[PDB]
Ligand binder design. Structure first.
Ligand SMILES: CC1(C)Cc2ccccc2C(N[C@@H](Cc2ccccc2)C(=O)O)=N1
Ligand SMILES: [Zn+2]
Ligand SMILES: [Zn+2]
Ligand SMILES: [Zn+2]
Length: 397
């Protein structure tokens, strides 16, 4: 598993994430596993489901050990639940190691496995703090690093039919950075706290124009990098200011309200989409150096996502892939697809460079540029109100 063996090891469907092959058990059971930087459990379908045709069969694994502990994970509209255990785990197209990891065998779920996704489980790559049922279930990547010599880093290159969804590809390089996957400078922003991959946005511009908000609004109540989310999601106030600005720029076109809520497509005749009327968006991330930031600039082709339907086929049609949040900013596939993203856990930082699989615009380029210096930079981080539950739990580690 040299970095050439890991290049191109991701597949997916537009809008249903990216997955990597993993094996579980002995003899090895091969499954397609969602790459999820927004969660911290390794959980696999482990019983029949109408939208799965394989699943982890614990009883066929001579190396499985039951942990005799359930786990139940609610989502906004779905859930998964299941039984904890440990087993041997390998990534066939990753580092040439086998590790004993925790595995949540999903016994029941609701609105979790979707018709046609092709993944059978999820690999939560974020930190122990957000693992369920608690921060004592070691996440996979922590086990990998503790048990082998793989460096404490991984990087993701997420690269951007008349009925069915577009096929996508990408690379997850485990333990390193492959310089063939990016061009230009690699810029790093600090990991603020090690729970989500949390970062701090200091400034936001839409077509070069500053939104002029209190910068804490940008990170209210956090900002995170999440391969498990499709859209760029923005806190309410920031989302309203952004929509106002993109509307202004594109006001040659009056779209319905449902378009701006992502609930309706807008279409132009084939090949005619006026890309020039939709503005670029720049997020400026706090730099490694005090008073410095750098920006990542996304093109309209990243945040307006094509969708082919049956009646709409003389036409190119698009969904607005920026949406309102009440749980802070989420830099999802919409942001990550422009970029090679380095999750440098050893150095508590995340790097961005322009990806080699570039998203194309006629006259503009998605970009990563810096530094930009601020006289008296000042703190853009939000401090989430400390609940009595968080406050009482003891962490004897
Ligand atoms: C799967 C995951 C990580 C967690 C989840 C759980 C339940 C419903 C939707 C989602 C969800 N929604 C994503 C969309 C998506 C991404 C990757 C695969 C499938 C859908 C989102 O809400 O942006 N993401
Ligand atoms: Zn394979
Ligand atoms: Zn105690
Ligand atoms: Zn703890």
């Amino acid at each position: 598993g040299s970095f050439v063996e890991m290049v191109d090891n991701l597949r997916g469907k537009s809008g249903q994430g990216y997955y990597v092959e993993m094996t579980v058990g002995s003899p090895p059971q091969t499954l397609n596993i969602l790459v999820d930087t927004g969660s911290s459990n390794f959980a696999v379908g482990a019983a029949p489901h109408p939208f799965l045709h394989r699943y982890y069969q614990r009883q066929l694994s001579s190396t499985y050990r039951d942990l005799r502990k359930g786990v139940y994970v609610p989502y906004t509209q779905g859930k998964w639940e299941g039984e904890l255990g440990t087993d041997l785990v390998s990534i066939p197209h990753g580092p040439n190691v086998t590790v004993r990891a925790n595995i949540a065998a999903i016994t029941e779920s609701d609105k979790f496995f979707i018709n046609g996704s092709n993944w059978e489980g999820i690999l939560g790559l974020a930190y122990a703090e957000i693992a369920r049922p608690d921060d004592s279930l070691e996440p996979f990547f922590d086990s990998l690093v503790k048990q082998t010599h793989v460096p404490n880093l991984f990087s993701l290159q997420l690269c951007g039919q008349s009925e069915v969804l577009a096929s996508v590809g990408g690379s997850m390089i485990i333990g390193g950075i492959d310089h063939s996957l990016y061009t230009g400078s690699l810029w790093y922003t600090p990991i603020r706290r090690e729970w989500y991959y949390e970062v701090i946005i200091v400034r936001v511009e839409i077509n070069g124009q500053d939104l002029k908000m209190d910068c804490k609004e940008y990170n209210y109540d956090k900002s995170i990098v999440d391969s498990g989310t499709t859209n760029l999601r923005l806190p309410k106030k920031v989302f309203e200011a952004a929509v106002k600005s993109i509307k202004a720029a594109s006001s040659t076109e009056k779209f319905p309200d449902g378009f701006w809520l992502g609930e309706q497509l807008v279409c132009w005749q084939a090949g005619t989409t006026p890309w020039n009327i939709f503005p670029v968006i720049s997020l400026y991330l706090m730099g490694e150096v005090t008073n410095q930031s750098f920006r990542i600039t996304i093109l309209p082709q990243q945040y307006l996502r094509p969708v082919e339907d049956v009646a709409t086929s003389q036409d190119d049609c698009y969904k607005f892939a920026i949406s309102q949040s009440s749980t802070g900013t989420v830099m999802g596939a919409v942001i990550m697809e422009g970029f090679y993203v380095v999750f440098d856990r050893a150095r508590k930082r995340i790097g961005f460079a322009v990806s080699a699989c570039h998203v194309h615009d006629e006259f503009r380029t998605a970009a990563v540029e810096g530094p930009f210096v601020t006289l008296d930079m000042e703190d853009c981080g939000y401090n989430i109100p400390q609940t009595d539950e968080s406050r009482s739990h003891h962490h004897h580690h």
